[PDB]
Design an enzyme around this catalytic site. Structure first.
Site, PDB file in Angstrom:
ATOM      1  N   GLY A  84      28.505  68.078  -4.106  1.00 31.08           N
ATOM      2  CA  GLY A  84      28.866  66.739  -4.866  1.00 31.08           C
ATOM      3  C   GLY A  84      28.385  66.572  -6.828  1.00 31.08           C
ATOM      4  NE  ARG A 169      29.435  81.637  14.867  1.00 33.82           N
ATOM      5  CZ  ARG A 169      28.440  80.962  15.311  1.00 33.82           C
ATOM      6  NH1 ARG A 169      27.885  80.166  16.017  1.00 33.82           N
ATOM      7  NH2 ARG A 169      27.509  81.544  14.356  1.00 33.82           N
TER       8      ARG A 169
END
Ligand SMILES: Cc1cc2nc3c(=O)[nH]c(=O)nc-3n(C[C@H](O)[C@H](O)[C@H](O)COP(=O)(O)OP(=O)(O)OC[C@H]3O[C@@H](n4cnc5c(N)ncnc54)[C@H](O)[C@@H]3O)c2cc1C
Ligand SMILES: Cc1cc2nc3c(=O)[nH]c(=O)nc-3n(C[C@H](O)[C@H](O)[C@H](O)COP(=O)(O)OP(=O)(O)OC[C@H]3O[C@@H](n4cnc5c(N)ncnc54)[C@H](O)[C@@H]3O)c2cc1C
Ligand SMILES: Cc1cc2nc3c(=O)[nH]c(=O)nc-3n(C[C@H](O)[C@H](O)[C@H](O)COP(=O)(O)OP(=O)(O)OC[C@H]3O[C@@H](n4cnc5c(N)ncnc54)[C@H](O)[C@@H]3O)c2cc1C
Ligand SMILES: Cc1cc2nc3c(=O)[nH]c(=O)nc-3n(C[C@H](O)[C@H](O)[C@H](O)COP(=O)(O)OP(=O)(O)OC[C@H]3O[C@@H](n4cnc5c(N)ncnc54)[C@H](O)[C@@H]3O)c2cc1C
Ligand SMILES: O=c1ccn([C@H]2C[C@H](O)[C@@H](COP(=O)(O)O)O2)c(=O)[nH]1
Ligand SMILES: O=c1ccn([C@H]2C[C@H](O)[C@@H](COP(=O)(O)O)O2)c(=O)[nH]1
Ligand SMILES: O=c1ccn([C@H]2C[C@H](O)[C@@H](COP(=O)(O)O)O2)c(=O)[nH]1
Ligand SMILES: O=c1ccn([C@H]2C[C@H](O)[C@@H](COP(=O)(O)O)O2)c(=O)[nH]1
Lengths: 213, 213, 217, 214
Positions: A84, A169
């Protein structure tokens, strides 16, 4: 190649250095088809992993922060993520489908679980915007945003570390959401390095889910 | 791209993933030449080096063992090196030229230094061959071979770690021999990533030789 | 704690952070939690059995090692570690070379007696070292003069390494496919590791270790 | 032992350390211990010429309690070891970073700072109560926690050598980093100073790139 994951996520291939033969060249230390494929299987079956470091991928990934936090634990790689501070962002959130709770026995119906999650992210997001509107700096206002906010990042990783990522994963012990990303990564890996990927599955892969799908 | 180094050494480019714009795309998580070149400078000036990790090189290097030992201290990279266990080798040796003893005050002509080095190398090599012929295993017989024996390796490295290597090795404090390799590495880097290389020299390069050449 | 290796080599423990309980602590934070010996030792076995390696990164060692360059050349391939080494560029090197014993050639058909293999190695070492000293005396800078020295020259270094990387080192180097010389160094590394972290070491041998020689030394 | 409180409920605790200033001196000298003056002088020399590898032989273990948005920045430091509390495996406590009104000083807000603080605590309260309801209805923890905000506190162990720790300080003990992580970095720095006084002083004098430790 781009694969959509979850409700708004994705994995896409940005670049790649090499293919199966890059591992072959490195193993032979030679710049200059059955033979080569056999060498790949031989390296994989004997644990000679370092040649695979000379194949490299760059991915662009859109994923919720809780998934990215798990992902960014893989230290043998490079990351760049949206902030941001640099760029004004889009604000989207991962809302699980009801089927995500299938197999669990909840006292609330799954669809209501989905609704409760959407409600709390709507309220969090609206609190964020009001704080921004009132002059609260972004780095403070954003701390009310939930862990299912989507983020994006570039990920550059070599095939050796990528195989470690798949071992951990693409496996039923990993959380379901990151399993889905790992499946997309594996699909891209398989497309670009079919010999390496087949040998990995046969000889070195430690997880369960890539053998059942 | 292949550059000869020392008497029998070289640096050869094998592959590259990306170019200057790979760093720009990763930094923005996404061409406009002026603004992209400006971003690269900005990153370099402010020490935001992670975007340069998304550019990757593979080199093929031929160098004497004493140079390779220094080189292999750079841990943030991938290496595969020739071993006598898998490949029969050529046995070649770095013999400095008399000019390598330019302006060292010595009591013997520089040319004679060259001659003495050649002699002992020749005798060590002969001994090695005698031991091999007599049935001694290679891994034992090679222990008599001198540090100026040439080896070859593949080196896969990203631009951030390559810049660190340039800072330390393209520098008068490093040994002259590895400086010569670093200059060749710098030439290839400059050719493939001119905007990154120029920004590096302008803002981040700590050494003393690359601004001379 | 210092173990002699080869003819002039050694491995010496300089320092250590943590112990078996360091890994128990690190593992437990996952569940918002030390307990007692039986449950904590049991956790170390659980971790090792299921491939949870990261808790062992919180155990760290510093070794001081003296070894031939051909051994160091293999050792320094282990990138997940920290090294500082004696420099041949900067210092004048001592007459210390690894001369194998005749027994080193046990198991091999030679046309020369092993004692003579041993003497031929010593001869070339002496000629090379003599040449080195003479170049130095003539003003040849040290970093050039040393290039004639053979790979059996001894060097010294500090090695700082965590238990996870050390276990990778043991898998690869305490193993019959590694060269015999580095095997000997890895046995010493293993003995020190077993002494400071007995529970981790025992569980590693039982569930995780992939090499062969430690299961029978 | 050493513990420094940070923010409203956070902390940095030193759990263990290996080595001291002399560990780096010992490591460097092998290239070629003496006395305290020449050894102090060597540490400054190393720092001055960017000879950083000797400092890798000094190692710390910290125990840190910090909000997730802080941890997210911290865990980008790859040259280190981490083990962290799991929201998949554990039921999370009601511990959230609520900034004080003073955090907004110098910013002109249309609500009083006090009300910003209240609005933050309200949204975190609602989010946490939703999480608890979901857990009680049988939703797996790993899904229930996705509604929790970035200011939830987490805990982790961090093992890191002095060289990587100096890089962390350069980047995080600096006014360009977010204020909250600066506060953690100030605490790391105070511990470093206490355990490696010569290294820390040399670091500040010759190598430190930031602006808050001065
Ligand atoms: C099912 C599951 C549950 C998990 N639960 C938790 C949890 O509760 N808490 C938690 O904190 N984490 C948890 N993790 C994360 C896990 O501990 C690792 O951080 C993550 O899986 C990355 O693995 P890695 O270290 O092998 O990968 P990378 O960090 O990419 O490292 C790759 C390889 O390089 C080596 N390596 C890299 N750095 C070092 C080093 N500093 N020292 C030694 N070797 C190194 C290792 O060989 C490693 O395999 C979990 C992971 C999984 C898959
Ligand atoms: C002129 C000169 C003289 C030298 N003399 C000696 C000597 O006498 N003895 C000797 O042993 N070595 C010597 N070296 C080698 C030097 O100490 C380094 O090993 C080498 O320069 C590699 O540097 P590096 O650690 O920056 O690179 P890499 O190992 O490639 O690491 C790159 C970067 O990653 C980081 N990094 C990687 N691993 C770690 C870690 N474990 N902890 C913390 N940070 C890490 C650092 O930021 C580092 O800059 C010398 C080098 C030079 C240039
Ligand atoms: C019997 C034997 C024969 C060998 N023969 C040869 C040979 O002929 N030629 C040759 O060049 N080498 C050879 N080697 C060296 C070998 O290829 C490795 O360099 C060495 O064993 C170090 O292993 P490592 O990478 O696991 O350890 P480390 O470098 O300490 O790494 C530890 C772990 O971190 C991870 N890791 C670290 N860096 C990276 C990275 N950049 N990318 C992905 N993952 C990473 C891996 O998970 C790795 O297991 C041989 C080794 C042995 C034991
Ligand atoms: C003010 C500020 C703003 C930031 N903004 C952003 C942002 O907008 N987006 C974002 O994604 N991140 C951002 N970051 C994070 C930043 O990009 C780094 O990820 C973080 O600072 C860790 O730094 P590091 O890579 O030096 O540390 P570590 O990962 O601990 O590495 C330490 C050193 O080792 C070397 N190294 C380690 N791994 C590698 C490798 N794979 N290749 C080459 N060298 C390596 C480098 O020398 C590095 O200095 C920001 C950080 C700060 C301080
Ligand atoms: O499956 C898991 C569980 C945990 N973690 C890591 C990521 C975070 O750093 C920390 C907590 O993650 P959660 O369990 O809260 O997702 O441990 C993983 O990487 N994978
Ligand atoms: O300029 C130097 C000097 C030393 N070293 C490292 C490499 C070796 O591991 C060790 C000793 O090298 P020599 O000085 O002997 O080359 O230190 C370098 O990398 N570069
Ligand atoms: O058992 C081995 C064989 C090779 N190598 C690495 C070290 C060198 O970088 C290269 C060649 O080593 P030798 O085979 O020459 O020892 O491969 C090892 O690490 N271990
Ligand atoms: O000061 C900063 C800003 C960003 N980031 C990294 C962490 C995340 O991976 C990504 C975005 O972080 P935030 O800007 O959302 O905190 O960039 C930092 O590490 N420090």
């Amino acid at each position: 190649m781009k694969i959509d994951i979850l409700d708004k996520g994705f994995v896409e291939l940005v670049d790649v250095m090499g293919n199966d033969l890059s591992a072959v060249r490195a193993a032979r230390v030679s710049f200059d088809e059955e033979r080569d494929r056999h060498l790949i299987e031989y390296l994989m079956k004997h644990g000679h992993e370092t040649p695979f470091e000379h194949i490299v991928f760059t991915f662009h990934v859109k994923a919720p922060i809780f998934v990215a936090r798990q992902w960014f634990r893989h230290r043998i790689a490079s990351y760049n993520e949206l902030s941001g501070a640099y760029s004004k962002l889009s604000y989207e959130f991962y809302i699980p489908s009801p089927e995500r709770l299938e197999g669990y026995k909840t006292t609330i119906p799954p669809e209501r679980v989905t609704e409760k999650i959407s409600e709390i992210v709507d309220k969090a997001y609206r609190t964020y915007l009001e704080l921004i509107e009132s002059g609260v700096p972004r780095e403070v206002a954003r701390i009310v945003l939930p862990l299912n906010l989507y983020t994006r990042f570039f990920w550059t990783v070599n095939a050796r570390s990528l195989m470690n990522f798949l071992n951990l994963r693409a496996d039923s012990h990993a959380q379901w959401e990151i399993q889905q990303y790992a499946l997309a990564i594996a699909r891209i890996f398989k497309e670009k390095c079919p010999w390496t990927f087949e040998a990995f599955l046969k000889y070195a892969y430690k997880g369960d889910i890539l053998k059942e799908v």
